[PDB]
Design a binder for these strands. Sequence first.
DNA 1: CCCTGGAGAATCCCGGTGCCGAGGCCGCTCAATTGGTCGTAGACAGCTCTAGCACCGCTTAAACGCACGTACGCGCTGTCCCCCGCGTTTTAACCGCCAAGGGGATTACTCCCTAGTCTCCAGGCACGTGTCAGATATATACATCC
DNA 2: GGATGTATATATCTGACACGTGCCTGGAGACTAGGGAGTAATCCCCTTGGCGGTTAAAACGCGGGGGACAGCGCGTACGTGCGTTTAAGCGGTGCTAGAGCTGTCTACGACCAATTGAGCGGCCTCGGCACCGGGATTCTCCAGGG
Lengths: 94, 94, 407, 103, 95, 107, 107, 78, 79
Amino acid sequence: RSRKESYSVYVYKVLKQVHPDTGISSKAMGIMNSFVNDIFERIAGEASRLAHYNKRSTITSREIQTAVRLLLPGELAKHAVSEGTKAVTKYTSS
Amino acid sequence: RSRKESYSVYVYKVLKQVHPDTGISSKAMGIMNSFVNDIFERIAGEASRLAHYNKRSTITSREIQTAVRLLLPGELAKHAVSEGTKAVTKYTSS
Amino acid sequence: RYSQRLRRRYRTFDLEEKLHTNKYNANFVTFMEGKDFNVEYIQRGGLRDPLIFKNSDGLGIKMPDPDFTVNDVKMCVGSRRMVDVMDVNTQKGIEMTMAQWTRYYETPEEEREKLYNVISLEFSHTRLENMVQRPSTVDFIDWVDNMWPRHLKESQTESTNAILEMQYPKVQKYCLMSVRGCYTDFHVDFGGTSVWYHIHQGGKVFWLIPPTAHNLELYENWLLSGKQGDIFLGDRVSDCQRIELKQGYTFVIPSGWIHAVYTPTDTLVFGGNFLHSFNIPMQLKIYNIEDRTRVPNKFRYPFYYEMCWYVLERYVYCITNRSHLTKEFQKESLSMDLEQVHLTHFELEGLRCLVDKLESLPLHKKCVPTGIEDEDALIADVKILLEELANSDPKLALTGVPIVQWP
Amino acid sequence: APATGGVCKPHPGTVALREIRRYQKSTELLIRKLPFQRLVREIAQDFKTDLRFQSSAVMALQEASEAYLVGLFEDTNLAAIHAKRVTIMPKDIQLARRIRGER
Amino acid sequence: RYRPGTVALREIRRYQKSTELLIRKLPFQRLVREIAQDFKTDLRFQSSAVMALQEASEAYLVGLFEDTNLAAIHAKRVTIMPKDIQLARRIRGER
Amino acid sequence: ARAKAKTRSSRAGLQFPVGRVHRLLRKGNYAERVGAGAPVYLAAVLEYLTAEILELAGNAARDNKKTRIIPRHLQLAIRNDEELNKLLGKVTIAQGGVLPNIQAVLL
Amino acid sequence: ARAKAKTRSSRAGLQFPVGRVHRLLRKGNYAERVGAGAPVYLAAVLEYLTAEILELAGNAARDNKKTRIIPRHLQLAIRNDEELNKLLGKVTIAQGGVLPNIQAVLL
Amino acid sequence: DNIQGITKPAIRRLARRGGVKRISGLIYEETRGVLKVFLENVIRDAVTYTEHAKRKTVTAMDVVYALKRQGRTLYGFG
Amino acid sequence: DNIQGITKPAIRRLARRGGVKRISGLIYEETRGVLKVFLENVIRDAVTYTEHAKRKTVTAMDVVYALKRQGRTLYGFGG
DNA sequence: CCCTGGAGAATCCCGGTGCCGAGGCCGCTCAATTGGTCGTAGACAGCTCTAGCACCGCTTAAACGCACGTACGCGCTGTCCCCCGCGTTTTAACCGCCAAGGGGATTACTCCCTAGTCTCCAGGCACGTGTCAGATATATACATCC
DNA sequence: GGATGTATATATCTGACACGTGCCTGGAGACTAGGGAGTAATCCCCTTGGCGGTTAAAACGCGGGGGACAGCGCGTACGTGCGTTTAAGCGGTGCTAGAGCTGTCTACGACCAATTGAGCGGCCTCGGCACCGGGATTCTCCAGGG
Ligand SMILES: CCCCCCC(=O)N(O)CCC(=O)O
Ligand SMILES: [Fe+3]
C-alpha cells in the first residue's frame, strides 16, 4: 500500500501559534492545501521564466525575491520579502 | 559578432507555394515570427502539463495530439491532427 | 502573532417613550356614573363616545371574589382547555392548555423567557359564566340577546370557540390575563363590535384613536403595509388619547375605535363584545376592512351576516307583526314566549345601510341563515317599512325602551 | 385541529427582500441533485458512449455552474439598474455577456 | 452648412479606414518619463519601448470606447457619459 | 562518531519543511540547478501567507461565537479583505456563499 | 563510410526545420526525455497554420490591388474569420487598425 | 430532455441569491441556454482529459483540470 | 501636469475610431485617469524587469513581457 | 343528581442508547542528514563602439477660443397589462437497505528506445547591389447634402 | 439646381525587397549502454440498479395593483466654421556611457555511500446531541354507588 503527502501538520503548527484554543475541520484543511499548492506553483513558474530570460541555468533566492515582488500586491510583498530575508540570514549564520 | 535566428526563410518558402506573385514586407515577417513563437510555447506548455499529470518523464506524439485537440477550435483541430498524422506516418516509413 | 500588516466585525419603535410622552393628549373619553348609562342615553347618543365608569354603582355588574387568581379561572374552565395565547414580541398566536398558562402566569417575572398574553378566553358555558355579569344596559341592546333565535342560543353546550359546535356568536364573556409588560398593538375589535372591559385586578393603559374616515384609511393602509412593528400608529394620526384604567374601572369602547393596550402590572380583566342597532354603518365598515385586509375567519365575529339577516327580521316582526322566519323557527319562538312607531335616526340610517348591504351581496356571500324563509320578501318589507318610518319624530323615539325585545 | 371562531389576535415586494436576505446567508446548493445528474449524463453522452462518473465530479460541476450563474445574475442586475428599471430582461443578460467577452 | 450628425459620420468612416497613431509623440514621451521617475531615478529608454506602450494604450482606449458606446445605446441614448464608462469597466472586472 | 543531525527548518527557525520543498523544486522541471537559499525563502513566504489567512479566519470564526473553522469563515475573511481579494480574485471556494449585498434602488 | 546526409524535413516532407524544433524542445525545460515523433508533428501543425493565415492575407491583399502584404491585410484576414478570431482573441497587432462597423442607431 | 428539470423556482432562488427583486417571464429560456453552453464546454474538456489517460471513469481531478484550463480555479476537491 | 498633454482632439479622434457620434463634456478627465492608471500598472512591471537584470536602460523586451503578464500579448516588437 | 375508583395518558426529571466528528498513541518504513570529491557555471577585470541624450533653426499643421442655434436629454402624465402573493392538489425527490460485477490500483520483468560521444560537412546568417512597386502632384466626373 | 466631398487617371522619383556569395558551427551518421514503460496477472473498491415509505417542493388558478412604455413640452449644451497662436517634425552636430564581448580563477552544487528518526496509517478515547423509554405523578374518563 502507498501513502500520500499533505501539509496538515504544519497548518496545525501555525494554527497553534495564532489561536491556540480553536480547531479546524477537514474541508478547510483541504482548501488550505489547495491554496498552498497554487501559490507554490505560481512562484516556481515565475522564477523559472525569470531564470530563462537572463540566459541562466540555476534558480537562486534573488529570482524568488523578484517573483514575490512581481506576484504579491502591496505591503504583502514588503512583509514577505522582509521575513524571507530574515529567515535566510538566520539560516546562513549557522 | 553574434548571429541570431528566425523563421523568415521557411515562412517565405510557404508563401511562395500559395502566392508566387505576392511579396511581403518586414513588419509582417516580424509579426509572423511572433505568432509562430507564441503557438510553439502554448503547445509545448500544454504537452508538458499533460506529461506531468500522468506521472511520466517523456513527451511523445500522443501528448502533442492531445494538446492540439485541447487548444485549437473546431475544424482547425481536425485538419491539424490529419496533417500531423500524415507527416509522422510518412517520416516513420522512410 | 506579530509581524503582520495590522480590524472589523464579522418592534423598532420605543414603547417606553410612547408611555412617557405628553403628546397623546386628546379628550375623547367621558367619565360617567352607572345610573346614567341606560337605553335612553344610547338612543339619544348612539353609543358614539368611549366611557369610563370609575365605580360600578348602578351598572349592574357582577364580578368574582376580589382575590380571584388565574388558578381559580383554570379550575372553572378546566386545566385541559386549549387557550389561544399571544406572543407579545411577534403579535402572533400560539396554543397551550390552561394549566400550562397558569404555570407561566405563576412563574416569577425574572424567570419568564418571553412575554405572553391571554386576551381571548371566552368562558360562556363554563362554571365561571355565572360569576360574571356585564352591564345591564348591554343586555337590552346586544344583538345576541335580542335578535338571535333563542332556541339556538340555549342549545349551546360547547364551552370552547370550536366553530362546528357554535350555535350563536359566542363572543359575550372573555377573561383576559396579562402579565406586566404585555402590549397589544393597534387594532379594531372584530366586526366593529363595541366592547365593555372591567379591570378586576391590576391596570391597563390604552391609546385611543377615533374612527374618522381618514384614520380608518390610515389603519387599513398600515395593515396592508405589513409594517406594524415599524410604525407606531398613534403618531400617524390626527389625534390620540392615552389614558390609564385603574382597578375597578369599567371602560366602554364604541364601534370602530382603533386602540392599543399596555399592561403595567399583572392584571386580570373581564370584558366582552357586542353588536348593536345604533351604529350599524360603522359595524359594516369595520367588517369590510377585515374583508379587504384578508383577516382569517378565526379572528372575526362568527355568523356576522347571518346575525344581520335576523336583525332585519326582528325589526319587521316587532313593528309590523309579519314574520320572515320559517314555520319551524316561528314555532320554536312561540314555545319560548310561553315559558305610529318612531325609530331613532341612528336606527333608520343603520337599517338602510344594512338592507342595501345584504341585498347587494352575491349568493355565495349572502349567508342567509337557516331560520329565514324568503329573504327577498324580507328585504322588500324592510324597504317599505323604512319609507313609512322615514318621518319618525326624533323626540318621540327617545322612549328609553328598545323597539326589539322578546315578549 | 378543529377551526376556532371568535379568537382575537391583531394582525408586493416585501417578501422578496426577506427571501434575498435568507438566501444570501445560507451556503447549500440551490438546485436539485437527480435532475442535474441526468442533465450532465445526457450532455456527456454526445462525446462518448458508456461513460461513468464519480460523485465528487458531479458535485464540483454543480458548484461551479451555480457560482457562474450567480455571478451572471449579479452582472445582469447591475445592467438592469443602469437603464432606470427594477425588472431584469433578456437584453440585460445579452449586454452583460457581450461586454464580459463571452460573445 | 451641414446639419449636425453628418460630419461625425464622415470622421468615423475616415478614421475606421486609416491605421496611424492618433496621439502626438513628444507629450506621450514626456508623460511616460514623468511616470517612470517615481520608481527609479536616472532611467534611459530605447526608441521602441515608447512606441510599444503607445500602441498598447491606444488599442486599450479604442476597446474601452466601443464598450462605452454599447452601454450608452443600452440606455436609449446617443451620447456617452462617465457613468457608461464606469459601468463598462466595472462589468469587465477592472473595478 | 558522526555529529548528531539537525533539520534545516529548525536551523532557519521555521515550521514549514525545507527538505521537502527542496525536493519538489529539484524534481519539478524548473531549472537545471537549484541554489541553497531558495527553499528557505520560499518556505518563509508560504508560512507568512498561511499565518495571515489563519489569523483572519480565526478572528472571523470567534466573532460568530464558535470554536471551529469552516469554509464559510475562510470565504468571509478572504472576501472582506482588500489585498487578499486581489490575489484570489479568480478562485471559487466550495460551500462558501457570498457576501450580503443589496442595492439601494431595490430597498 | 558515412553516406550522404539527409535532413529529417526532407524525409517527412515539410518546409519547417525539424532538428531546430527538437533542439528547442530539448533545451526548453519541458521534460526529462523527448520522444522521436514530437518535432515532426509540431512542425506540421505550425506549417499548416502558417499556410492558412498566409493564404487569407494574400487574398485580402489581392482585393486591394497590391502585390505585397502589410499588417493591415493580416489584421483583416484574422478578424474576418470566425475560427482564427477565437484563437487570437486577446492579441494586439501593431499598425493593424480596426474593422469597419457602425451601429444602426447612429445612422 | 432533462434541461426542463431545472425548474423556474430554482432559477428564482439563484436570482434571489444574486440580488434580484423582480424577474420577467422570459428569463428562464435564456438561462437554460447559457447553462447548456457552459456545461457543454466544461464536459468536453473533461472528457478529453479522461480519454488521454485511457480510462472509462471521469474522476474529479479531470473536472478540476478542465476548470483550471478555462480560468475558473476551484478549491476543495483535490 | 504632463497628463494635460493628451488633448481634447486626440480623445475625440480615439472616440471616432471607437464609433461614437456625440460626446459629453465630462469624458476627458475620466479617460485621462484611466490611461494614467494603465500606464503606471505597465511601467511598474517593466522597471522591475529592468532592475532584476542589473541594467539602467528599459528595453523593448521588458515592455513586451510586462504586457504579456497581464494577458495583453503584442505582436511586432520581438518575441 | 354528587363522589368514586377501574382504566388512561402525557411527557419527560431523567436513565439509558448510539452515531458523529475530532483528537491522541504506536510501529515502522522510507526520506532527510552527514561526510567527501570534483568539475563546470558564474563572478570579475578590461576594452570597444552603438545608440541615447542634449541642442538649434524654421515650416507649418494643429490646437485654441469665440458665436450660435438647434436638437437631444430630461421631467411630468396616463393607461394598461404583466407580475406578485396565496391557497390547494399533485408529483417526485430523498432516504434506508441489498446485491452484483466492472474496472481501478498494485506488482514482476523483459527489452527497446533514448541519452551521451566522435567526427564531417552543408544549411543558413551576415554583408553587398540593383530595379520595380508604391506616394504623391494635378486636372476631371459623379454622387451626395441643403 | 447648386455647392461640396470623394473617386478617376498619368508622371516621376525613390528606397526597400529580393537575389548573390563566403564560411562556420550545429545537424547528421554510427556506436554503446541502461532504465522506463508495456504487458500480463490479481484483488477488492465503488458504481449502477432496484424497491418501499414519507413528505416537501412544484404546478395551477385567481385577484389586483404597480411599473413599463408612449406622448408631450422645455431648455441648455454640444457640433460647426472661422481667425489667431503654438509647438511638433525634420534636418543636422557633438559627446559619451553603458551594453556587449573576451579571458581567468574559484567555489558551490551534483552525485555517492552509510545511517537514523519523522510523519503516516491504523486503531482507541471523548464530549456532545438525536432519539428512545418504562413508568409514573398528576390529573382524568366513566357509569356504578349513595
Ligand atoms: C375580544 C376580547 C374582548 C376585548 C379584549 C381584547 C382586546 O381586544 N383588547 O383591546 C384588550 C387587549 C389587552 O388588554 O392587551
Ligand atoms: Fe381591543
